[PDB]
């Protein structure tokens, strides 16, 4: 609830969500939130450069009716402060797939078994320049 | 709006909003609303193919504290149903400038006292493919 908020996205399984934005030069962390609304998130995507005692680690979680699920920590960190990052997200019944820069990718389980993604929110040290659906 | 709603846009003067979407093959009309929130719009951009008596007409208005302003009609209609169209909006303290396909450009007076545009809603027979800031 500080960066761009979009609702009625109507993202369907198999469709690709493309997001391009600027990572702040003094970036500590940023957040991409996806799901039904702010209380129901299939993906809380949180690259931490230096925040909460995490350094250069992507933290992923879900939110079910207002309650945070269990955190998953990724093995890769293809982000750098002061640079233009692009993120592509697609999903199906079992998994979200996140494609990062430099050919990196990961899966995160679809814990809420959502069939549409209608909500997206950005927060922290990341400024969206572009959102595309294909 | 059944279509895309965006808030915290933070579109400052001189910055440019680019929207690309598909006009349905049987489009009657579609809507881009820009402003502070649903009640306070510096621009209600409403191309009418066939709606409210009008045929192939662009209808522009504002909304201030819930009340519609004086309506304005443009003379050009560079939209065709069943095709992809891009529209670009930029603003200053005096005017919004709307750039249409096929080169046409018109001004609409900015009737509110807005530092920044924080709210965008799409509606009707227009499906957003891409949204960009500059
Ligand atoms: O799980 C995503 C959210 O994580 C917290 S920070 C989070 O806090 C818990 C205790 O409540 C544990 O210490 C975790 O190890 C730590 O990562 C953030 O404040 C939220 O913004 C989400 O990012
Ligand atoms: O002014 C923008 C809104 O227009 C109305 S329809 C509108 O109705 C007024 C008064 O009732 C006049 O007849 C106008 O000539 C006519 O265009 C729509 O319902 C709104 O959604 C806005 O598009």
Distance spanning both ends of chain B, measured CA to CA: 25
**Distance separating alpha carbons of residues A26 and B27, to the nearest angstrom:** 46
**Distance separating alpha carbons of residues A69 and A58, to the nearest angstrom:** 16
Q: Cα–Cα distances in Å, from B118 out to A25, A30, A76, B10, B126? A: 24, 20, 34, 5, 21
Question: By the CB < 8 Å criterion, does A131 face chain B?
Answer: yes
Tokens for A128?
Answer: 């969206």
Give the determination technique.
Answer: X-ray
Cβ–Cβ under 8 Å, residues A22 and A30: no
> Which residues of chain B are within 8 Å of residue A128 when distances are taken between CB atoms?
133
Let me know if A114 is exposed, middle or buried by CB neighbors in 10 A (0-12, 13-18, 19+). Answer: buried
Distance of residue B78 Cα from the nearest chain A Cα, in angstroms: 23
Q: Cα–Cα distances in Å, from B122 out to A42, B115, B131? A: 25, 22, 11
**Distance separating alpha carbons of residues A128 and A22, to the nearest angstrom:** 6
**Distance separating alpha carbons of residues B124 and A5, to the nearest angstrom:** 21
**Distance separating alpha carbons of residues A9 and B5, to the nearest angstrom:** 8
Question: By the CB < 8 Å criterion, does A84 face chain B?
Answer: no
The radius of gyration computed from the CA coordinates of chain A, to the nearest angstrom, equals 14
A81 is in an annotated binding site: no
Biggest alpha carbon distance in chain B? 38
**Distance separating alpha carbons of residues B61 and B74, to the nearest angstrom:** 11
Cβ–Cβ under 8 Å, residues A70 and A64: no
**Distance separating alpha carbons of residues B82 and B93, to the nearest angstrom:** 35
DSSP letters, A25-69, are TT--BEEEEEEEETTEEEEEEEEEEEETTEEEEEEEEEEETTEE-
With a 6 Å cutoff on the Cβ, whether B73 touches ligand 2 is no
DSSP-assigned letter for residue B82: T
**Distance separating alpha carbons of residues A88 and B127, to the nearest angstrom:** 20
Let me know if B131 is exposed, middle or buried by CB neighbors in 10 A (0-12, 13-18, 19+). Answer: buried
Question: By the CB < 8 Å criterion, does A128 face chain B?
Answer: yes
Q: Cα–Cα distances in Å, from B120 out to A127, A133, B130? A: 17, 17, 13
Atom of ligand 2 nearest to the CA of B31: 23
Q: Report CA dihedral (A65, A71, A75, A78) to the nearest 10 degrees.
A: 50
Q: Could you give the domains of chain A?
A: 1-134 (2.60.120.200)
- Compute CA B3 distance to the chain's CA centroid, rounded to the nearest angstrom: 13
Distance of residue B11 Cα from the nearest chain A Cα, in angstroms: 11
Let me know if A45 is exposed, middle or buried by CB neighbors in 10 A (0-12, 13-18, 19+). Answer: buried
Could A9 and B4 be called an inter-chain contact, meaning their C-beta atoms sit closer than 8 Å? yes
Cβ–Cβ under 8 Å, residues B120 and B5: yes
Closest C-alpha among B16, B3, B15, B25 to residue B87: B16
Cβ–Cβ under 8 Å, residues B113 and B97: no
Question: By the CB < 8 Å criterion, does B130 face chain A?
Answer: yes
Phi and psi torsions of B116, nearest 5° = -140, 155
Mutate to test the interface with B, among A2, A3, A6 (most CBs of B within 10 A): A6
Cβ neighbours of B32 (radius 10 Å): 25
Tracing tokens 């808030």 back to the chain, one arrives at B7
Cβ neighbours of A115 (radius 10 Å): 11
Beta bridge partners of A134: none
Question: How many residues make up chain A in this entry?
Answer: 134
Closest C-alpha among A113, A102, A122, A119 to residue A47: A122
**Distance separating alpha carbons of residues A9 and A134, to the nearest angstrom:** 12
Tokens for B99?
Answer: 């750039």
Helix (H) or strand (E) run with residue A85 in it: strand A84-91
Cβ neighbours of A68 (radius 10 Å): 11
Q: Cα–Cα distances in Å, from B116 out to B45, B71, B113? A: 18, 23, 9
Could A132 and B133 be called an inter-chain contact, meaning their C-beta atoms sit closer than 8 Å? no
Tracing tokens 């950005």 back to the chain, one arrives at A122
Tokens for B48?
Answer: 């009418």
Taking the CA of B72 as reference, the closest ligand is 2
Tracing tokens 């500080």 back to the chain, one arrives at A2
3-state secondary structure of B102: helix
Could B133 and A134 be called an inter-chain contact, meaning their C-beta atoms sit closer than 8 Å? no
Tokens for A26?
Answer: 């003094």
Tokens for B39?
Answer: 């009640």
Q: Report CA dihedral (B45, B127, B116, B76) to the nearest 10 degrees.
A: -30
Burial B97-116 (b: 16+ CB within 10 A, else e): ebebeeeeebebebbbebee
Could A133 and B134 be called an inter-chain contact, meaning their C-beta atoms sit closer than 8 Å? no
């Amino acid at each position: 609830a500080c960066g761009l908020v979009a609702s009625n996205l109507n993202l369907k399984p198999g469709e690709c969500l493309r997001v391009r934005g600027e990572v702040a030069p003094d970036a500590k962390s940023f957040v991409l939130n996806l799901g039904k609304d702010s209380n129901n998130l299939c993906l809380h995507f949180n690259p931490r450069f230096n925040a909460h005692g995490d350094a250069n680690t992507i933290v992923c979680n879900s939110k079910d009716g207002g309650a945070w699920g269990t955190e998953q920590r990724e093995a890769v960190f293809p982000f750098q402060p002061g640079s233009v990052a692009e993120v592509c997200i697609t999903f199906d019944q079992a998994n979200l797939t996140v494609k990062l820069p430099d050919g990196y990718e990961f899966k995160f389980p679809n814990r809420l078994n959502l069939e549409a993604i209608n909500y997206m929110a950005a927060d922290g040290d990341f400024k969206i320049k572009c959102v595309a659906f294909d």
